[PDB]
Amino acid sequence: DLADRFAELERRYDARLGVYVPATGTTAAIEYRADERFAFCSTFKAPLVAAVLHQNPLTHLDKLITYTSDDIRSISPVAQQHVQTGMTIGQLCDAAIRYSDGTAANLLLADLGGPGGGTAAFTGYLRSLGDTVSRLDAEEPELNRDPPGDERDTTTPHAIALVLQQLVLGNALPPDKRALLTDWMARNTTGAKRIRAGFPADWKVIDKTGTGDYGRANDIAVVWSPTGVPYVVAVMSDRAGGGYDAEPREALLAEAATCVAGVLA
Ligand SMILES: CO/N=C(\C(=O)N[C@@H]1C(=O)N2C(C(=O)O)=C(CSc3nc(=O)c(=O)[nH]n3C)CS[C@H]12)c1csc(N)n1
């Protein structure tokens, strides 16, 4: 019914689209490939900073972290500007959410500590939320590179939407920490052509994007209707049929999102 447009959209872009909007009191859950595994790509950075916040007192945001140019291995628009000074955990969080900074995410994982540079603690962190499905296995940028069907570094639209749900609308974080996670997503700079572009402007949209190879383009978001009702939208997509080199298509995420808005209005 709405499945007919999502599959319609998949045909248009030669894509696989996963969509999840958790049910509220007034609205029914929206499921499209909701429980199929998609790659996190950079979408993991939002629950990752929640992993850091949850584990640490606010005072920890001021911990200065140093690193070398050798640590800068992926898209890091902020971390490159700070090889000489380093960054505090807080700005690493800021960098990780608002600019999808990959090196900043890697150091936050290292701050999570432990095996695989913190990927097991981060997976462990998702389990604490009730997400038994997801796993992060590599750091940036290898986690964007797993071949299709490989279960490493994947989540599901269902799984991630519910994780975000407790992070932003629930009680996964104390209120003062919840406020920090929400504002970074709210002033994120990377999702203007994705979920945000499909909803009317008078809807509020906070989001964290993800992009990888095989045409992988994700956006996880929390949106508020003009009346102020919150919904969570998971939109995930890849274009594996085109190989490692498949171009990501943002139009797919904006088009799909509009469909969601049409049903949520
Ligand atoms: C909500 O995001 N919208 C954006 C966008 O990408 N802008 C970014 C955002 O939020 N930015 C911020 C900052 O971090 O505050 C800034 C400041 S960044 C900065 N601050 C310092 O104090 C410093 O010492 N050095 N630097 C580099 C300007 S735009 C960028 C945008 C860009 S053009 C346009 N019309 N919108």
Swiss-Prot record:
Q: Where does the entry annotate site (Functions as a gatekeeper residue that regulates substrate accessibility to the enzyme active site)?
A: 75
Tell me which EC number(s) this protein carries: 3.5.2.6
* Post-translational changes noted in the entry: Exported by the Tat system. The position of the signal peptide cleavage has not been experimentally proven.
Where is this gene product found?
Cell inner membrane; Periplasm; Secreted
Instruction: Report the enzyme's class at the first EC level.
Output: hydrolase
A single GO BP term for this record reads: response to antibiotic
Residues flagged as site, Increases nucleophilicity of active site Ser? 45
Q: Which GO terms describe its molecular function?
A: beta-lactamase activity
Reaction(s) catalysed by this chain's protein: a beta-lactam + H2O = a substituted beta-amino acid
UniProt keyword annotations, A-Z:
Antibiotic resistance, Cell inner membrane, Cell membrane, Hydrolase, Membrane, Periplasm, Secreted, Signal
Usage in biotechnology: Can be used as a biomarker, which together with BlaC-specific fluorogenic substrates, allows a rapid and accurate detection of very low numbers of M.tuberculosis for the clinical diagnosis of tuberculosis in sputum and other specimens.
Name the residues annotated as catalytic in the UniProt entry.
42, 140
Please name the Pfam families in this protein's record: Beta-lactamase2
| InterPro entries, alphabetized | Beta-lactam/transpept-like (IPR012338), Beta-lactam_cat (IPR045155), Beta-lactam_class-A (IPR000871), Beta-lactam_class-A_AS (IPR023650)
- What regulation of activity is recorded for this protein? Is inhibited by sulbactam, tazobactam, and clavulanate. Sulbactam inhibits the enzyme competitively and reversibly with respect to nitrocefin. Tazobactam inhibits the enzyme in a time-dependent manner, but the activity of the enzyme reappears due to the slow hydrolysis of the covalently acylated enzyme. In contrast, clavulanate reacts with the enzyme quickly to form hydrolytically stable, inactive forms of the enzyme, via irreversible acylation of the catalytic serine residue.
Q: Which residues bind substrate?
A: 100, 209-211
* UniProt record similarity statement: Belongs to the class-A beta-lactamase family.
Role of this protein: Extended spectrum beta-lactamase (ESBL) that inactivates beta-lactam antibiotics by hydrolyzing the amide group of the beta-lactam ring. Displays high levels of penicillinase and cephalosporinase activity as well as measurable activity with carbapenems, including imipenem and meropenem. Plays a primary role in the intrinsic resistance of M.tuberculosis to beta-lactam antibiotics.
Q: What is this protein called?
A: Beta-lactamase
Q: What is the lineage of its organism?
A: Bacteria, Bacillati, Actinomycetota, Actinomycetes, Mycobacteriales
